[PDB]
């Protein structure tokens, strides 16, 4: 019997091809499912996770902070135009809001 090696490893991915496949199969989406669909899904989810984690890490280091916290996730999403667009209708718990003051509210000399 051949040594068992995982599909994620075969694809160079970290997300589970088998698990994503089972959830896709059992999500009542279709009776027949292709082999490449879970590969694509795992690749897109890993890519998006990698980009969000990059921005959140950047924000954390800018704050001299070593662990990603929800505040850093909220800052990372809102500070990128495309992530903010994708997640326009998403509220992050414990995320707060962007520091931003309208020009008219600032004091004048």
């Amino acid at each position: 019997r051949a040594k068992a090696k995982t599909r994620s490893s075969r694809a160079g991915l970290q997300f589970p091809v088998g698990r994503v496949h089972r959830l896709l199969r059992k999500g009542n989406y279709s009776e027949r499912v292709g082999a490449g669909a879970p590969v694509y899904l795992a690749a897109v989810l890993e890519y998006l996770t990698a980009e969000i984690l990059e921005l959140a890490g950047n924000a954390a280091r800018d704050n001299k902070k070593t662990r990603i916290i929800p505040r850093h996730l909220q800052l990372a999403i809102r500070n990128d135009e495309e992530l903010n667009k994708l997640l326009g209708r998403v509220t992050i718990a414990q995320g707060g809001v962007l520091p931003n003051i309208q020009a008219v509210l600032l004091p004048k000399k």
Partner: protein
């Protein structure tokens, strides 16, 4: 009853402050109370409907998450 006064004036001021407003009219408070109450009515209606369909007697966090999702604002952090 009298619990509508538990959303206290400094609390509405603080929520409004996070919204970025600098000055708050005295008539704002009643308006905020009304808007919040209507919002709650709709959310709680949906939540209790879900609880009753499942033959439960306690509103769960997941019921609330579904109510919020179907209301058009998805909330992350309590499951799902």
């Amino acid at each position: 009853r009298d619990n509508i006064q538990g959303i206290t004036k400094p609390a509405i001021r603080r929520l409004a402050r996070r919204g970025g407003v600098k000055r708050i009219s005295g008539l704002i408070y009643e308006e905020t109370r009304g808007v919040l109450k209507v919002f709650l009515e709709n959310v709680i209606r949906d939540a209790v409907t879900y609880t009753e369909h499942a033959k439960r007697k306690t509103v769960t966090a997941m019921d609330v998450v579904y109510a919020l999702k179907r209301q058009g604002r998805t909330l992350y952090g309590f499951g799902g």
